[PDB]
Design a binder for these strands. Sequence first.
RNA 1: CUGGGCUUGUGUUGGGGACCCGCGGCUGCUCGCGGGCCCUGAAAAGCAGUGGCGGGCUCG
Lengths: 146, 146, 49, 254, 184, 260
Amino acid sequence: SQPGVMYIARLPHGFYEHELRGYFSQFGEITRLRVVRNKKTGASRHRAFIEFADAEVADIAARTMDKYLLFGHILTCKIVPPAQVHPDLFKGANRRFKVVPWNKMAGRQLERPLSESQWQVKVAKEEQRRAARAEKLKEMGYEFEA
Amino acid sequence: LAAQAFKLLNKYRPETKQEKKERLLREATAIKEVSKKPYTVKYGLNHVVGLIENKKASLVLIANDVDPIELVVFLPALCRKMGIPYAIIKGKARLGTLVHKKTAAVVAITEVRSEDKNELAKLISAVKEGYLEKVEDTRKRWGGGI
Amino acid sequence: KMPLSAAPEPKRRFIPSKNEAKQIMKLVRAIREGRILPYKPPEEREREE
Amino acid sequence: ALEKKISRALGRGDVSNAARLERNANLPEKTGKPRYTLNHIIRERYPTFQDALRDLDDCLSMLFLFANLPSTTAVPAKMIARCERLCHEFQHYLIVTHSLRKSFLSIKGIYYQANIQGEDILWLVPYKFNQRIVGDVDFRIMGTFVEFYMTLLGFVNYRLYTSIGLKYPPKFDQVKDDQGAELAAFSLEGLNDPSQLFANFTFFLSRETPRQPLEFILRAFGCKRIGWDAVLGEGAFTTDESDPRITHQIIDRP
Amino acid sequence: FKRAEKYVKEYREQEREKIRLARIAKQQGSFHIPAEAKLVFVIRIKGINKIPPKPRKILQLLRLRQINNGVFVKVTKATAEMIKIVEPWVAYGYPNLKSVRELIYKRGYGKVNGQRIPLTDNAIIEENLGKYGIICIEDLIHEIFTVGPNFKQAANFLWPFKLSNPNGGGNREEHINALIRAMN
Amino acid sequence: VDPDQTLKACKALLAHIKKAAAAPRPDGKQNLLADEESTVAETPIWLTLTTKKHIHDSHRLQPGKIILPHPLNTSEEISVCLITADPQRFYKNAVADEFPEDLRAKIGRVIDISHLKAKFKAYEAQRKLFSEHDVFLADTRIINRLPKALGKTFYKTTTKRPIPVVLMAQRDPLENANARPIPEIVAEIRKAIGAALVHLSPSTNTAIKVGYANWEPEKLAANIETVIRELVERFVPQKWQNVRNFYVKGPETAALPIYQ
RNA sequence: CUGGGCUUGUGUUGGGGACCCGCGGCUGCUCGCGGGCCCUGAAAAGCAGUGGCGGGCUCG
């Protein structure tokens, strides 16, 4: 009665979570599903972990869908035994994975008006950083001043 | 796998008698008033076995219903000996449709055009993973029983 | 690892077809003597029946 | 067997072979010309050209009905466009030779009576209005009598058009017909009591008035100039009512 | 048993819908058209199965729910927004006057008072509304072939014409005249 | 901006790379395919603009050409590819019966857009194409289409992105191919190859190729000065209000600053 | 500025590395953002993190 964890990889672009949940729900009962994505840009690593209610339906689905040429991707659906199953393996299951625009965030995080006291810290971090660079090009024989 | 095989093979269908005659009338007309080697699907048991023996074939498809079965018994093992990936397919009628005959016992691909070298190598990998791996420890065992 | 036959490959596998060439010239003589109509492109077929 | 062979390349799979068999089929839905050659059948059926005009009583009146009819699966729109072409061809012959004499109207529609070589021909034309085909009717049977009276009127108007000596078929312009000329889209080149009625008259048809029967009657009696509205049609006399050349303007308004 | 391929085709075909709809909303709700006003006949085209909400409500606004029916529409600034949004499921182009002539005569049906009855008589056109210069069938064509001050009212009387299914057969300049010619 | 101190840095960095390259490598090994002069050459130094605002807050993915007084990629081993938005045979015949002798040598492979999506969709093939040539051009009619066709392997890095080339007149392929007069084509190809390239990214650092480490420094100093003045007046917004540090640095050494 | 160009048209598979940088932050190491040089069959075995508008599901 224990749940069985199945590892599916070589995922085509388009076979993400809701389509992954939809197809394997035709086999049995899907409890928790989480694809492996990237926190920098939301994008699948072509690898997903699924877990069914029954161990019988986990072995049936993996054996019948193991090598299945889907959109140029010969899949790899294997059964992770309950011996391994890492405890923090579904930390974000059944949750949207939002696409956070960090470069737009950090790009205009620089642009906002800043505190005058912080602008003193800006100068201090500047002059420390210019001074060490003057050191590291003096063995290159270079002096530049500003 | 059968559907994905015939997706590539239908792109390499041999010319029919109607359109072969049309092309001959095209080239003869231009002489009254520049091409490369044609890449088709190779057929004919005596032709394909020779292409197997000279290692000129890349993928082989074998009908499962050849009624003197002696014509195809050695053919999986001969492809195994020379290393050419093979797949036993349903329908001697299906292969004949692919090659414009009533029947075809065996169908081979030798070389494909440059626009689809990748999907042939993907189809070959889907045979040595999806078909020939499952056959491996069950092709040497006797069938039936009771 | 190597092909079974060590026989040489004939030059006819690397050049255009002899038999297709002889069939072409038979159609040329038909067009020369007018027995066979010349080739009409599908655009000309669109201006037909 | 030809429709059996069109299930051949469709079944096994050959788009090119299915095409080349179906151009060889010469199916009526894209041609307008019929599927079978009716030349020898009408050779044995009707004995003399006078009986063609006797059979023109039935031949014309359904095709004026069929040309107003919409398209179904049995009758393609190209068959109706060829019906509307052939119904216009008989009309252009009548307005040249002025053979139309008597006309009657009733609940069913408009009856025309014309004498050709001493033979009276009667046909019924319903009004320009879509007719309900509600009930149990056979279009497959109905599509055959289209093919019947397509070839018969095509044979009848071919014989009479060389009889009057004008070159056949008459020349047609596509896009100028597509602008809505209806009757006036086509040019006729004569070499390859009726006339005295409105011999020198000027006519205009307004927005309510039936454009097709009024122009057909006027040109059949030699009316030289007929104009109408720009939304009723085009390629006619000047639309403007302020132009004083018009003698009589047809108006049916409350 | 829906195969997995169908699932992947869906998502790639919904993301392309999301991408194109963002590009429409990015630039403007405008189309590169000359300042002269014309009229467009739009026909429902079998297309993408799952409809996003914004192209769906535009079909509803153009009473384009069931397949293959078609309505008339002029050009405004707002119309070109609806044209390029619902474009993969419609075919559009400027028709011809004779093409309207079959559409009101041979293809004409009626809509009055919320129930759809066929055209019955010219006096029934008077009975329907018959008031804003509506005296015969050519009233609708006058509001269609020429740009009509009450063409919006003329469309209000109008119902989407259920066009006929053909058998084996970007703005079309005048190629839409060939569209009804196989679909009449 | 001052030219003399830019020159004396340009002496110093360039002289460093000869000392670095000529120094032996301590595991007792040599290189067959790397001469001392060949690695003193073929090592580009490039100007690294540093800004305050993130310039062009989007991914432009299309290079801008700064006309350099003396061209960048006019060596003897340059393979160049012209991706064209029309029948390949018309340009193949154009580059064979014309396109002088130097341009005939550098034209490695001209490829249609339609033939590119058929033969180079896979990621072997767009990696084999990346390593085979050195500079990639493109017609302006297919500049937008190349992100899908030549994907991350051509657009993750800014070293080799397709250069926009105008090849139009001012459609059935076999009947007509709207192109310039042929001498106007080959003249414009010359401009595109040897131009210093800007790449707008939502970023503070912009690396612009200025030359290789075998040129003579005054040649370089005239080239960097034209790169400096063109980039501020044309590309970076808030021309001198948004300007910041300007370093010059080789691929294996530290950064030599100029400030603005 | 008639003749040559300009400017908008936003569209990138994912990992790894025994390497050179630039800019942000924090008590801080270090971590982010953007480049540069390599490897890779359309390859793959937790390490998922940033605050919100609305709508849905709920407790009074």
